Amino acid sequence: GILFTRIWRLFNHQEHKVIIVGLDNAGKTTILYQFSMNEVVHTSPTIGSNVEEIVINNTRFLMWDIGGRSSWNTYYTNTEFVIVVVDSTDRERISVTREELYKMLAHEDLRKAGLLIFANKQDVKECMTVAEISQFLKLTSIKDHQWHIQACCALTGEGLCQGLEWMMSRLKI
Numbered sequence: 001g002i003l004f005t006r007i008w009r010l011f012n013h014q015e016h017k018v019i020i021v022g023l024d025n026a027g028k029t030t031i032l033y034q035f036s037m038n039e040v041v042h043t044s045p046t047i048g049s050n051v052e053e054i055v056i057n058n059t060r061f062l063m064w065d066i067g068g069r070s071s072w073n074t075y076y077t078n079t080e081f082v083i084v085v086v087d088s089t090d091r092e093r094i095s096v097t098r099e100e101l102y103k104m105l106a107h108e109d110l111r112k113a114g115l116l117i118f119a120n121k122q123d124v125k126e127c128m129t130v131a132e133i134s135q136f137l138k139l140t141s142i143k144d145h146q147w148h149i150q151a152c153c154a155l156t157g158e159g160l161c162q163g164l165e166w167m168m169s170r171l172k173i
């Protein structure tokens, strides 16, 4: 909505580099699409294995599916935030997200990155609760990075304003 646009544009007064990952079908493309509305987008190829580069306004997003790589290490440096999109209805694969997440955080090049966990598809009945996702990903174990888990619905955009607001609060801090 218009409120997201106000906050998003404010955020883009500076340049940013964000990595957005998650298992296939977590809802990454849907979220980026929401971020793209009424903004300027520039996509470009990557010698990237299956990494897609999407620049929205002044924010460079590097997106890719986990759970399918040495090829990612080159992108970590200078990344301010790692956005992990989680399919809240997938109890079967939450362990995969967890395994991959911790394999990424071990890379010293992501030392200063903030971690935003979007618990997506929270609109779906019987989906895992945000508390459950935090528990199954053992987020409290993360003492060296700032993190925030956010309930969201990429279809409606609900939760995206809050997630973006967390990112803004973390930067000029």
Ligand SMILES: Nc1nc2c(ncn2[C@@H]2O[C@H](COP(=O)(O)OP(=O)(O)O)[C@@H](OP(=O)(O)O)[C@H]2O)c(=O)[nH]1
Residues within 6 Å of the ligand: 022, 023, 024, 025, 026, 027, 028, 029, 030, 031, 085, 120, 121, 122, 123, 124, 152, 153, 154, 155, 156
């Ligand atoms: N209920 C529900 N669905 C969501 C949400 N977010 C994304 N989805 C749906 O999940 C599917 C995969 O999303 P997509 O953004 O392509 O995933 P990805 O890019 O991470 O692989 C899409 O369904 P289709 O492939 O059937 O079009 C999409 O509409 C959500 O918050 N709630």
